[PDB]
Every structure is written in C-alpha cells, then in structure tokens.
Amino acid sequence: FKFTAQQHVYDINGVKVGGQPGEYPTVLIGSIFYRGHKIVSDGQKGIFDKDAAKALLDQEAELSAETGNPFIIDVLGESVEALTKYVEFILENTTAPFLLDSISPDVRVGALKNLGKDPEIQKRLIYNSIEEHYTEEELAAIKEAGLKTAVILAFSKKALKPNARIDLLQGKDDKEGLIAAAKRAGIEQFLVDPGVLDVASNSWTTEAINVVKEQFGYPGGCAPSAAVYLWKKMRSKGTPFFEVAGAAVFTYPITQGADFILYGPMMNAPWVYRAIATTDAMIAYNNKLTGVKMGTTEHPLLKIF
Amino acid sequence: FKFTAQQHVYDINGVKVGGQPGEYPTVLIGSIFYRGHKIVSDGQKGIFDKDAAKALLDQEAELSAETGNPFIIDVLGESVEALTKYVEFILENTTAPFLLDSISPDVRVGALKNLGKDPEIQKRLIYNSIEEHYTEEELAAIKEAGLKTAVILAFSKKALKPNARIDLLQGKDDKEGLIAAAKRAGIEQFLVDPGVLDVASNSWTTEAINVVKEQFGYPGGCAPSAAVYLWKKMRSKGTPFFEVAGAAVFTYPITQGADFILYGPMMNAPWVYRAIATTDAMIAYNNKLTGVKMGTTEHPLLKIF
C-alpha cells in the first residue's frame, strides 16, 4: 500500500520525518518532565534531577544509534518558569529537536516569550500544538518566536470520522483551517496528530493519519501513551504484560503507514525502540516487492539483525 | 483493509477462524511437546508430566476466557508412539481443536493411522500440514481418517516471494498445488500458512496471507516463533525486549488482516494473549469504517478494557 500524494519529508535539525511507508524509520517522541515524573521535585519552579535528565537523553541517543529510529524530545511543563528551564536544559544537553508542550496554552506562550526568536529555537523547537481552540495571542507568540515547525492536533470531539480531518486542516464554512492558522503564525512544516481518545480508538486515529498522508502528504503520527497509562487492568499486571500491550498499541499506527509516535515517558524507551524498530524492519523489507527505496541507510532493517 | 473475496469462516468444533478484519478475534495456537519442552521426560516414548501439560491447557482456557481469543493446540511429536499418546492426552484433557504436528511426515501419517476413523478426531484434529513434500500415501491416510481441515503450509525455499507461495498453493505448470492436493485427501477447510523464512520476511508472509484472503477467502496465518527464537541479537537482550520484539512480529500479520498465529511454546501464552487481544481490540473498533460486523460478542474489544 502506497499514498497518492507526494509525501512531505521534513528535515528538523537532521531528523527526517514523513515519506511513503518503508522510506524513513519511525521518529520516536519520549516525554520528560510530565506530571508525576519522579525527576521533578517542584513542577512550578522547575526543580529537576539534571543527572537523571541527562541519563534519559543519553539513553535516547544510544537507543537511536542502535535501531536508527531518530528521536524528538516531548518537553512538558506546568508553569512558564519550569518549561523555560526545561527547554534551556534540553537545548544544552541533546542535539535533538523537541516539542514545546503543556496542557495549558498560556504556559507554552509564556515560555516562548522567554526563549525568544533565537535561531536555535527556530531550528529545534516544534510547537505542541496548534489545536481547535487556538488563540490569536498564541499565533502571535509563535510568529514572534519565528517557529517553522508545529504539531497540528487535527482532533475535534465533533470531527470524529477520519475524513473530517480534511475539514479541520483545510477549514469549512466560516471556520479557518488549522493549516491556515499555522501558516498565519509563519509555520512552514506541519506534523499532523489526529489525537487519541482511548486505546481502541487508536484505529480511527491511524485511519485519520492515512487520509492526511493520502490527500495532503503531511507527516502523520499520534500520542497513544495517555490511553495506555489509563489502562490500569494492563499496567498493574507488570512485566512483560504492560510492555507487550504498550508495544501492540505503539506499533499499530506504524503498521498502517504512520511517521511518528509520542510513546509517553522516556523511561519506556528501551522496550519501545526494540518493538518499533521490529515493525519498521518488517515494513521496509516489503520495499523489495513494492520498489519503494529507503531514504537512509540508518534504518532498523539494516541494523537490528 | 477489507478483503475482495467472500471470506470462508470455519467452525472447527466451536472455534470460529477466518472472516474480514474485526469480524472474529485472532485464533491463538500454542505449541506443546515441541523439541526441548522440559515437561517431556522421553520424547521417543511420549512420557511427560501430565499435571504440567494440564496446567498449560488450563492456563490457555483461562487466557482465552479473559480476552475472547479462541485457542487450537499445536501438538508436536518426534515419533509415532509419542504423537499418538500426546493426541490421546489432548482429546481427554481439553475440548479445543488441535494440530496433528510433526516435522516428519512419516510420524504424522503413523500417528493418524493409530487414531483410525473417529468422529471426535474428524471434528477436532487439524492436519499440520499439507506441504511441498506431500505423498499419495499421506493424502490416502488423511482421506482414510476422514479429516476435513488441514494447515496448507507454503513454506518453501523454492517459493520466497509472496506470488511464488500463491503458485505453490494454487498450482502452476505441471503442479496441481497444495490446495488441490488437500482436496484430493478430502480436506474441505484450508488454514493457509505461507511459512516464515525469517523475521524481516514476516511482511512477505503477511503479503501472501493478504493475496490468499483477497483471491480465495481462506483463513490465513503464520508461525513466526522459530524465526524470533533464532534472532540472537534481540533474544540476547532478555526480558522484556525479546517479548516486545516477539509481540511486534506476532501482531504484524493481525494488523494486515490475518486470522490465526502459531505463537510457539504455550508457556509464552500469558504475554502473547495480552499483545494479540490489544491488536484485535483496535482492529474491531475500525469495523464501522471497514463496513464489517463482529460475528461474536466474545471479542477482546468487549472484554480487555
């Protein structure tokens, strides 16, 4: 199976994301400083374990080198002060691009004012996310920071059908599309995340990714970790039951041609990389029948066996 | 995914196998008395710990009840004497259908001859397998036993690519093919296993399953356990890395619409069931988008959350 639209392949500070299935390895996006992360003692002041944070980033680099799966760090914060310090640390202690991420839009906006229109911010900071309820002050903050890449959260609790993401992105009736909104903020590269409600609905998320890649060619991915962590019946079972259940959820979108996964807490990277690399390897081996050419020699198929 | 051909759904003594993606849960097939199975004290005579064997069968039934994934037991033997006793034990100690399985055709035929004409055997025993080395003696032994279901195994190093495996199944030039051979033995129900040459080529196995379901509508599955166990680089990493890699390999065919998985030793059932149930749940949630109706309420989607 191949997509009709020519696929966007973005180069975000060296990380290739997008393409036809089997062309590029899955980009894996691990969360750091999330709510309840044990390496954060004060989520308001941003007091965190610098040694432990560095160890997670070094582990991510090592797993990436082993499998060929590139990484983007999901940097979460509950306050402007905290998220600013987290981003300053991430900039210094890895080369990877990263999501500027918060539940609260004003935390993302405040952090951007602090980080400013730094050329490094423009190259490495991906805004997470341009969502249905975006504000003009949010677009102003993105434009003033000169960001070029954003996650487009193409989710609406009233665009549940995959096909309805066309309306969300392009606009409909009197409603500006999320792509138009992003472009007004000066965004040039769009990572489309159709959103995940629960584990089962990951199949609708993946169909939405397929619609977006088929018709627009934007890189498609999703964030199933919250749904997996709300699955107490599985998580309480411990090893290896939680990990293989998680593996089934995180690999599923990749089996249908998705480009990136937000796999949740970085502490899970060791098993997530091994599962995702396995799926990537099997998909790319199908290239030998389809004629799709791998865009890089740094691919699980050439590395994990 | 929805498959072109009208799908064959077989009722093998109460186990539903086949159909469109999300119609029926994955049938899981665990191996017992395999080479080096430590509950066997004498593999030539078929002497084994019956309590340990029963404990495995009870565990399978408990896991099946939990997820709604039906089970068929893969009964392996290295001698006629041993495989005959194993089949006798399985008939009395579970209600499940089972594969009569040996790497040696002489062992399968010998064991089958010992079982004679038995309606319970005819309902529950699946011949594993009709493969490239089949003989008229073997087809005659199957017909004499009155078997109605067989695994059709297209594992051949003369048939690497999916279309070559289809040629082995459907026939080509001077060869009737494995399905035609099975029909001459009186087989009316075909569990098509294209074989797994290695881990990466599980995508080729899955493409062969797709062509089978697309064109013939026969249930399709595979046995990737041997390939995964021979993956030294991943196996060397231990738990849970080996299990999540295994889960990625075993779930991949299911994500592409496969009907059954031989997951290897039954001792791995606890994590295999959890991984496969997860995939099944996501696929069945897709049913509205595919135009499919669940054929049973005994489905992971309605059980595991």
Coordinates of C-alpha atoms in Angstrom, one line a residue, chain A residues 22-229:
Chain A
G22 CA 9.3 1.9 4.5
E23 CA 11.1 5.1 3.2
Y24 CA 12.2 6.5 6.6
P25 CA 12.3 4.9 10.1
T26 CA 9.6 5.9 12.7
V27 CA 10.5 9.1 14.7
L28 CA 10.0 8.3 18.4
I29 CA 9.0 11.1 20.8
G30 CA 9.6 10.4 24.5
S31 CA 8.1 12.6 27.3
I32 CA 10.2 14.3 30.0
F33 CA 9.1 16.5 33.0
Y34 CA 5.4 15.1 32.5
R35 CA 3.1 15.4 35.5
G36 CA 4.3 12.9 38.2
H37 CA 7.8 12.4 36.6
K38 CA 9.9 11.4 39.7
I39 CA 12.9 13.5 38.4
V40 CA 10.8 16.7 39.1
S41 CA 10.5 17.8 42.8
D42 CA 8.8 21.2 42.1
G43 CA 6.8 21.5 38.8
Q44 CA 6.1 25.2 39.5
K45 CA 9.8 26.4 40.0
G46 CA 11.2 23.6 37.6
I47 CA 13.5 21.9 40.1
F48 CA 14.5 18.6 38.3
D49 CA 17.3 16.0 38.5
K50 CA 19.9 17.2 35.9
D51 CA 21.9 14.0 36.2
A52 CA 18.8 11.8 35.7
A53 CA 17.5 14.1 32.8
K54 CA 21.0 13.8 31.1
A55 CA 20.9 9.9 31.6
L56 CA 17.5 9.7 29.9
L57 CA 18.8 11.9 26.9
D58 CA 22.0 9.8 26.7
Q59 CA 19.9 6.5 26.8
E60 CA 17.7 8.0 24.0
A61 CA 20.8 8.8 21.8
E62 CA 22.2 5.3 22.4
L63 CA 18.8 3.5 21.5
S64 CA 18.5 5.8 18.4
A65 CA 22.1 4.9 17.4
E66 CA 21.3 1.1 17.9
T67 CA 18.0 1.0 15.8
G68 CA 18.3 4.0 13.5
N69 CA 15.0 5.5 14.9
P70 CA 15.5 9.3 15.1
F71 CA 14.2 11.0 18.3
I72 CA 12.4 14.3 19.2
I73 CA 12.0 15.1 22.9
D74 CA 8.5 15.9 24.2
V75 CA 9.3 18.6 26.8
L76 CA 6.3 19.1 29.2
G77 CA 5.9 21.9 31.8
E78 CA 3.1 23.1 34.2
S79 CA 4.5 26.7 34.6
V80 CA 6.3 29.3 32.4
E81 CA 9.3 29.3 34.8
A82 CA 9.5 25.4 34.8
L83 CA 9.1 24.9 31.0
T84 CA 11.6 27.7 30.2
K85 CA 14.3 26.0 32.5
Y86 CA 13.4 22.5 31.0
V87 CA 13.9 23.8 27.4
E88 CA 17.2 25.6 28.3
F89 CA 18.4 22.3 29.7
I90 CA 17.2 20.3 26.7
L91 CA 18.9 22.8 24.2
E92 CA 22.3 22.3 26.1
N93 CA 22.2 18.5 26.8
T94 CA 21.0 17.0 23.5
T95 CA 21.1 17.9 19.7
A96 CA 17.6 16.5 19.1
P97 CA 14.6 18.7 18.1
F98 CA 11.9 18.9 20.9
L99 CA 8.2 19.6 21.4
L100 CA 7.4 22.7 23.5
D101 CA 4.5 21.0 25.3
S102 CA 1.9 21.9 28.1
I103 CA -1.8 21.2 28.9
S104 CA -2.1 25.0 29.4
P105 CA -1.6 27.3 26.3
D106 CA -0.5 30.3 28.5
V107 CA 2.4 28.1 29.8
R108 CA 3.6 27.5 26.1
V109 CA 3.0 31.2 25.2
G110 CA 4.9 32.5 28.3
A111 CA 7.8 30.0 27.7
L112 CA 8.1 31.3 24.0
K113 CA 8.4 34.9 25.2
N114 CA 11.4 33.8 27.5
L115 CA 13.1 31.6 24.8
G116 CA 12.6 34.5 22.2
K117 CA 13.3 34.5 18.4
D118 CA 16.6 32.5 18.9
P119 CA 17.8 30.9 15.6
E120 CA 18.3 27.6 17.6
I121 CA 14.6 27.8 18.8
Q122 CA 13.5 28.2 15.1
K123 CA 15.5 25.1 14.1
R124 CA 14.9 22.7 17.1
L125 CA 11.6 23.9 18.9
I126 CA 8.4 22.3 17.5
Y127 CA 5.2 23.9 18.8
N128 CA 2.8 21.3 20.5
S129 CA 0.3 22.1 19.4
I130 CA -2.0 24.2 17.1
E131 CA -5.4 22.8 18.3
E132 CA -9.1 23.6 17.5
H133 CA -9.2 26.3 20.4
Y134 CA -6.0 28.2 19.2
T135 CA -6.0 31.9 20.2
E136 CA -4.6 35.0 18.3
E137 CA -2.1 35.7 21.2
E138 CA -0.9 32.0 20.7
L139 CA -0.3 32.6 16.9
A140 CA 1.3 36.0 17.7
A141 CA 3.7 34.2 20.3
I142 CA 4.6 31.5 17.6
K143 CA 5.3 34.2 14.9
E144 CA 7.3 36.4 17.3
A145 CA 9.5 33.4 18.2
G146 CA 9.9 32.7 14.4
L147 CA 9.0 28.9 14.8
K148 CA 8.8 27.0 11.4
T149 CA 7.5 23.5 12.6
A150 CA 4.4 22.8 14.7
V151 CA 2.3 19.7 15.6
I152 CA -1.2 20.2 14.2
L153 CA -3.6 18.4 16.7
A154 CA -6.2 17.7 14.0
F155 CA -8.7 16.5 16.7
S156 CA -12.2 17.8 17.4
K157 CA -14.8 16.0 19.6
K158 CA -17.1 16.8 16.5
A159 CA -14.8 15.7 13.7
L160 CA -14.5 12.0 15.0
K161 CA -14.6 10.4 11.5
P162 CA -11.1 10.2 9.8
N163 CA -12.4 12.0 6.6
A164 CA -13.4 15.1 8.8
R165 CA -9.7 15.9 9.4
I166 CA -9.8 17.3 5.8
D167 CA -12.3 19.9 7.1
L168 CA -10.2 20.6 10.4
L169 CA -7.0 21.2 8.4
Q170 CA -8.4 23.0 5.2
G171 CA -11.2 24.8 7.1
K172 CA -15.0 24.7 6.4
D173 CA -17.8 27.3 6.3
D174 CA -16.7 30.3 8.4
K175 CA -14.0 28.3 10.3
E176 CA -10.3 28.9 9.4
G177 CA -8.5 25.6 8.9
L178 CA -5.7 24.6 11.3
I179 CA -3.1 24.7 8.4
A180 CA -4.2 28.3 7.5
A181 CA -4.0 29.3 11.2
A182 CA -0.4 27.7 11.5
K183 CA 0.6 29.5 8.2
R184 CA -0.6 32.9 9.6
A185 CA 1.8 32.2 12.6
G186 CA 4.6 31.6 10.0
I187 CA 4.7 27.8 10.4
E188 CA 6.0 26.1 7.2
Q189 CA 6.2 22.4 8.4
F190 CA 3.0 20.6 9.7
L191 CA 3.3 17.3 11.8
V192 CA -0.4 16.1 11.8
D193 CA -1.6 14.4 15.0
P194 CA -5.3 13.4 14.7
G195 CA -5.5 12.7 18.5
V196 CA -6.2 9.5 20.6
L197 CA -9.3 9.2 22.9
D198 CA -8.6 5.6 24.3
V199 CA -6.6 2.5 23.2
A200 CA -9.4 1.0 20.9
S201 CA -9.9 4.4 19.1
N202 CA -6.1 4.3 18.0
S203 CA -7.5 2.5 14.8
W204 CA -9.6 5.7 14.0
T205 CA -6.5 7.9 14.7
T206 CA -4.5 5.7 12.2
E207 CA -7.2 5.9 9.5
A208 CA -7.1 9.7 10.0
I209 CA -3.3 9.6 9.5
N210 CA -3.9 7.5 6.3
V211 CA -6.5 10.2 5.0
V212 CA -4.0 13.0 5.7
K213 CA -1.0 11.2 4.0
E214 CA -3.2 10.0 1.1
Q215 CA -4.6 13.5 0.3
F216 CA -2.1 16.1 1.6
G217 CA 1.2 14.1 2.2
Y218 CA 1.8 15.8 5.7
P219 CA 3.7 13.5 8.1
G220 CA 1.2 11.7 10.4
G221 CA 1.6 10.4 13.9
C222 CA -0.2 10.1 17.3
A223 CA 0.2 10.0 21.1
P224 CA -1.4 6.8 22.5
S225 CA 0.6 6.8 25.8
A226 CA -2.1 8.6 28.0
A227 CA -4.7 5.9 26.9
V228 CA -2.2 3.1 27.6
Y229 CA -1.4 4.5 31.1

